[model samples]
Target: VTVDQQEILNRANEVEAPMADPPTDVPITPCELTAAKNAAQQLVLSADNMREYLAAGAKERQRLATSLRNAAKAYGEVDLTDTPRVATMDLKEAARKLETGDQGASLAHFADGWNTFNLTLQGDVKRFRGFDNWEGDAATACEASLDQQRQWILHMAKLSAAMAKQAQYVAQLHVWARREHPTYEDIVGLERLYAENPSARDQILPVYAEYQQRSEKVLTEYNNKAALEPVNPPKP
Candidate 1:
């Protein structure tokens, strides 16, 4: 859908006259005014990118946390007596708070988990060092349990840092989407311009098509992550 010259002229005509003779002293030409409008319209359109990214990020975080829980449950056969089992418990609680949108408290709890888990891992490392040699299946089981805890702890830290870094950008994008740029009302004018002209569809279709591609890219990334970490019921 490309815009023909006639369609462009017609659409511009609808807004041009008033723009040329603004009732104010702004002296804004039709070309200048629509150029500004188009610029703002682009901002308004890009808001979807932020929205999609946030949703995708949230889903990815949820999937990662869920996988962590799976690992935690599977490794329960290993004696957690020597380990700081409470750190794992707090990690689970943090995940719950995060899911419910308590990011700040979730991050704080994750930090605590990191410290406790690190202490537990340090104990394991010392115990392993004290070993004369690999103690057969016992040693293997202990190492596996330690490794699982290590990975889970690392992931909690990573997620906390990742979300903290992303928070700034998310806030910025939210502001742009809601207040700092062309609003929904402002975009309606541009939408009307294209709607009234059948021939203009091609020109604006590319705009929408590009938006679709970007949006799908975000969702596809989430899908890939989800596929790799498919949902599973929490084992009792």
Candidate 2:
């Protein structure tokens, strides 16, 4: 639905403005202002990324995870004993957690499954005795699948981290907004306070000016981090 500019103006004109001039005296500290801005940026970033994450197709990601699970189940069914049994258990746990809706529980299982499969299972995959054609294909494909899984994990790490880190900032600003106004929500509302009530920009605009220096690049920072790790490869 592409809304035209005229339609927006049509709608905008219909809405009534507040009769009184907005107040100019909001009481906020510098640190609080920064924290609120950070939180607001987090909300700004999270909204689109999650929408796009799904829009780009987590269905494909689900298939990738399923393929890994399928290969694990196949190997476990035939191997009977040794590491594949434990590996299957870990892989199964990932699937179970996902199926049962405990995504956090699934995270470790996925990591452990990869470790066990790559480190131990690879050693036994075709050691003294090799499997028939199907098992051979399955085992090798399992190895190949892990490579994709790691790629997907690497791609995903930044987005989730940005969301996680920004969540704290959201809470940091929430308290102040509610205290300042009965029905405060989002940075836009606080920005309104600044625009109408002089106190907002008066105290925080310096910080905001400093923020403006870099604020235009907010999404850029997220994009850069998403593309690659910071500093050196070993910087973590």
Candidate 3:
């Protein structure tokens, strides 16, 4: 069954249009700014959801991986850490690919990285069972790191979507504004869109930076905690 296009737009307007804020000396009319603000609001909502996902992923991973990390570090087992390093390398490559506009390839690498790390965690547990299952904790920690990496990967994916929306809105505004003999409202609409959606470079970049700081803090906290707690190995 096909959905009604006008109905969709109407519903969107009803849900997303700003609460009729009065326009000011910016030369933007309430109608114009309302559309602009609606687009801006969608981007904002997407960003908020992405941030929440990342934060929740971080918290879950921290809980799952803490004991494992301490055990791995105390035992000085490269096997426990090697998969994590590879996973992070994949994440780094994903970031680089995303920067270069290869989002599909970037996402693939991110998935690969996360999966490889996860499988390796299971392998570590099986390989070190002679150590009385303390390696299980190490495996859990590695999985936590893997989950956090997945969160970063997903964040980049969301960033790609947000950037695309920003660019599309900017182009739409430009097209409308550049039409021959546009009305005053048309010009004002373009101005408002330009102001809000010049590029994700202005708005989303700061959000990305903020997420970077949060991720860094998560890592820092994990490392500090692992450093302080020695693994409590079971007696032979």
Candidate 4:
């Protein structure tokens, strides 16, 4: 059976929330300038953090693998870290970049970051046990600590992904906060169909009325000209 579209639209990509503030001229007073400078510096610090996160990911993976190697010397089996694996779900970095821009993570790199966790490391527990069954088998202290470490690694994995996704957004704000040189034309282009393609009038009519009016005029003028053209089309 089919579900009602209204119910779905009510929860889904409906324009159901407040819009962001549109760009405006700078507030230029010493008081305002000081506040703006502080805000810009904060963005710089955050962008630097995300960039470090991207650059440090592989390093963290290397360190974690080394720890596993030392823990078990399953040196041969722990080699799985060297091979590639499929990225995790929904945690990808693309979604936020549209909203955040340059401050966001380096695209798929964070997925690249926490990829050291896999079956090899998980199953290599034997090697881990082989080396440090710290409290012996009765209390299973080694196994308990192993589970805790595993949870910590997973936590880092989630943290890395969360931070990676925000990198672009944070970076965009940094650039805009200063907005000193090389502005929108240098870095950005039109929103795909609305400004670049004139194919979705109904889709954008309510959302961007002015853009729709402009784009629709272009569409109709082209159609009218084509109606008067030779049946045999000219080559470009």
In candidate 3, list every pair of residues with a backbone clash.
65-141, 68-137, 68-138
Q: lDDT tens string, model 1, 1-30?
A: 121333222322321122111011111111
Candidate 1 worst ten-residue window by lDDT:
80-89
What are the clashing pairs of model 1? Answer: 1-202, 2-202
TM-score of 3: 0.30
Give the TM-score (vs. native) of candidate 4.
0.26
Clash statistics: count for each candidate: 2, 4, 3, 11
Model 1: residue 159 alpha-carbon error in angstroms? 14
lDDT rank order: 3, 2, 1, 4
State how far residue 121 of model 3 sits from its true place (Å).
22
lDDT value for model 1: 0.32
Worst 10 residues of 3 by lDDT: 80-89
lDDT of the structure predicted as candidate 2: 0.33
Question: What's each prediction's TM-score?
Answer: 0.25, 0.26, 0.30, 0.26
lDDT of 2 by residue, 20-67 (tens): 221122122212233333333333333333334433334443454455
By TM-score, how accurate is candidate 1? 0.25
Location of the lowest summed lDDT over 10 successive residues in candidate 4: 227-236
- Badly placed stretches (over 4 Å) of model 2 are 1-42, 55-57, 62-134, 137-139, 150-158, 173-236
Backbone clash total, candidate 4: 11
Which candidate has the highest TM-score of all? 3
Candidate structures ordered by TM-score, highest first: 3, 2, 4, 1
